[PDB]
Amino acid sequence: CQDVVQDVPNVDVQMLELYDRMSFKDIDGGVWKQGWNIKYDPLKYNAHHKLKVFVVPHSHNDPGWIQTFEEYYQHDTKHILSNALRHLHDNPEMKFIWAEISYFARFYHDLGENKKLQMKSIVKNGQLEFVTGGWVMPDEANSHWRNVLLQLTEGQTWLKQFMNVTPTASWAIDPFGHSPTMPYILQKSGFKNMLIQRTHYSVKKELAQQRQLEFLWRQIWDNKGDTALFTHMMPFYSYDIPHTCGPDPKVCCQFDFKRMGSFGLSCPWKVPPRTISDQNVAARSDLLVDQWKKKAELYRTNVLLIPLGDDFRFKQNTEWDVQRVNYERLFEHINSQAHFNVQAQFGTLQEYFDAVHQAERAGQAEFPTLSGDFFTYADRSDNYWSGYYTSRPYHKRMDRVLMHYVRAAEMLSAWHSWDGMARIEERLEQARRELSLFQHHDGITGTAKTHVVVDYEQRMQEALKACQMVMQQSVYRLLTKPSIYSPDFSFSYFTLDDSRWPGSGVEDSRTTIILGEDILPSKHVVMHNTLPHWREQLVDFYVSSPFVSVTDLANNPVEAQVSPVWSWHHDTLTKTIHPQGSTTKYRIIFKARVPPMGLATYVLTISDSKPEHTSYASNLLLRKNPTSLPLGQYPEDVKFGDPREISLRVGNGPTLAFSEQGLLKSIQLTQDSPHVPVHFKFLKYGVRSHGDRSGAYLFLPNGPASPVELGQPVVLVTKGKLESSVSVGLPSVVHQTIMRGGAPEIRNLVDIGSLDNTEIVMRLETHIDSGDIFYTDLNGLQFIKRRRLDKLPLQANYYPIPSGMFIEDANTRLTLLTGQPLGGSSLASGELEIMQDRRLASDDERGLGQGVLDNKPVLHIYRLVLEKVNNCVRPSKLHPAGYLTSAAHKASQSLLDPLDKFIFAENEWIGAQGQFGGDHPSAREDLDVSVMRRLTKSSAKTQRVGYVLHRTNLMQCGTPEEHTQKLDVCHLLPNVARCERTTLTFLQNLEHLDGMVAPEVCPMETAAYVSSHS
């Protein structure tokens, strides 16, 4: 195994280093506005060294953006595909690449058999070529790597089954900035090449000058280079035709033949395209070939890529004709005019890369190596696209919830083979596709029109319901005596209980367990743990009486705590934000202990009075002018007081101090240790009154944030033996700090209401001497070192915070883990900040055509980990990566993959068992079974189950290792007859494994295995 901490990779271009050196000056470079006037030596190309040009027709089809997926399909895409089939069939030399499989699959299943056959033939013969082959072209900033893999697998599995092809070249022309998580996943999925486009204009300029636009992109910690994937970065401002033929858009626009008038398009540079003819072909060719040769100067081989397309292009037959005919005339003239020394033709993306590597192999060029990422993107001036790291935060949080439900549903149902009548495969396929669709770069990014966001939400809601149905049927079969199990596949044996989604104050959706001497004395509940190690976590349920005790199925008492159900209200009468306690329902909390990838059953029983093993939390409402807060049967009276500083300690955990406004002020790790200053504060960013306005994409603040005026907020303190918390009703946010014995959990119920042109940020202030350094993660896969650069504007120092961020000095580290992707930064030494929501009245001119005024309450969740790191073995100062500690990693897992909770729906569960998976191996803490998916239907004689195993890298800080058993996923199911290592998509077998044993992977590595069973 490579050491990912101590050896600094030696690469030609290291993005953090390049950023530190670059000046980012935005000067007018001439017709190539962000570059310079390219000059070339006409003698470079000649009879023995020609410029091979590949013109690649393409059509960018967004699976939802300003129209929903289905509206685009009906109005545009089905026509584009229908006409592509006809035109390619009839013009053998014409080519076309396709990226979005969600649309292709939608089209293909609507085709008659005759057309399906014609389609397969033009794919088989190379005319229509799939690039990437994912369900969508995902966002690369907010997306979790697990969902990036999920959508890639969904599209590629469909392609393998129906088109018999697996793309090895990726095409990503629209994500707003790019992540190294893509080549990581792609290189482990059989890919050989990839192309990206939206990178900062200054980076394009810099790499172009060095001819470093094509590079072997390896991971930041990869010393050897085995993760390397050849990458081509386009050089210009857009993927449209005016910005793809060469440096001068006024000339290139003249070669987009759909802009002559009848199509309602024109050239903004004021020179229109002109139909190519025998009398103008020489002059048109001279202009075009000159653009081509200039573009060629920015690359190292004599093979040139010329994309030819734009949004939803190649729709009308007349469009296909006008583009094809004119280009055929240009090619015939250019290729027969020896003096140009050019051979041009229509080509596919793979054809381009194949020719590039043939040149490389002929010793024509050597490519530089590169590590790093391409955030935060700016397409021009100071227009940095960091706004979308936060836009539509409700759905960004929903993404993570569904992510986990999909994994749990596929894992829980994987244990058995199911009869087709159970509709398990059907429900899982729908859930995977709706979550996959939302990975689109106008989906999770929050950059779509209001009605389209609603469509994605409705789709995800159905996906959540599908996961629940599958999960609950699976639990029932897994925990019921086999000879008693009698399933009704449409029946709800269990109801899922989720305490954080939609969340208290967002939707009153949780069911109350109703017990009573005259109706039902007890209720079974079951917890599922998708992680491959034994796990304990507190779980809570609503019950109709405070006198409830908990036992496991061996009838052993389980210590429990009951607290009130508190809801916050904006009292329009008193003009205050305060809590009201339920008088009919209460929260019971207890520690669940669950096997690796298993289930554990508990029983809640009502009693006449206080049960022996249940304690009750005290509650204290701090505010001036208090009024009574009755709680029905709750046995402890609420206390009142004037606002004041307070301190709390649960178990042996840290002791936290809060200001009289209910916000954290300090953390004390142990009884002896000091009270380390850690202050939470909420602020607001505004919008500029002159110049460019912030929108769904752009963050253009009118300067540093201003503190939110807090007034004298109401603060609620609940103190319990198992869980305590401090909650405060601030303007736009009910902020909560929850303590359970370890790092606190933070929850923000964010309702930006009608606060127009406002962005709410949550900031942490400490004395940590971090200077200008901070760390943020990429797709929940790795942490990359960031350096705040004052030579760039504030918005440029904002980065995606998909799951975590931290700052540290030689001795102390503060890590903030998130349950949703949001944007954030460290704008001053000792600080961390992350945006909660943003409401913008204006459009930011990137095509959306609207601002963001559809905000809705959202419950953001976090874990805040303060730790001493002076004893930790960390990477050297020049290493571009950072790594989490064991506690921070566990804390992230508690947010993204919590225990799932199920309430038995009927009165009695006959045949109930207390546990499943007690014999599953409890793997080392840095290892996870990211995916467990049965790959065969029940009629398959040989059953196959796929596993994706990921090993992160945790810092060694002096804590002895201990125990843990080897996890061999190939032996998790009985009767194994074969074990194979495969690509991450499970589509290609890479290794037949001896003894049918799946070995574990190395730190930061990810592998897939498929076990076959008789």
Ligand SMILES: [O-]S([O-])([O-])O[C@H](CO)[C@H](O)C[Se@+]1C[C@@H](O)[C@H](O)[C@H]1CO
């Ligand atoms: O013309 S336009 O206003 O629709 O926008 C252009 C071309 O200028 C874009 O490239 C459309 Se790109 C389509 C969509 O997925 C992105 O959100 C858009 C971000 O800008």
Ligand SMILES: *[C@H]1O[C@H](CO)[C@@H](O)[C@H](O)[C@H]1NC(C)=O
């Ligand atoms: C297509 O995949 C392979 C690769 O060319 C080919 O040999 C085979 O005939 C096709 N697969 C099937 C099952 O039709």
Ligand SMILES: [Zn+2]
């Ligand atoms: Zn797009």
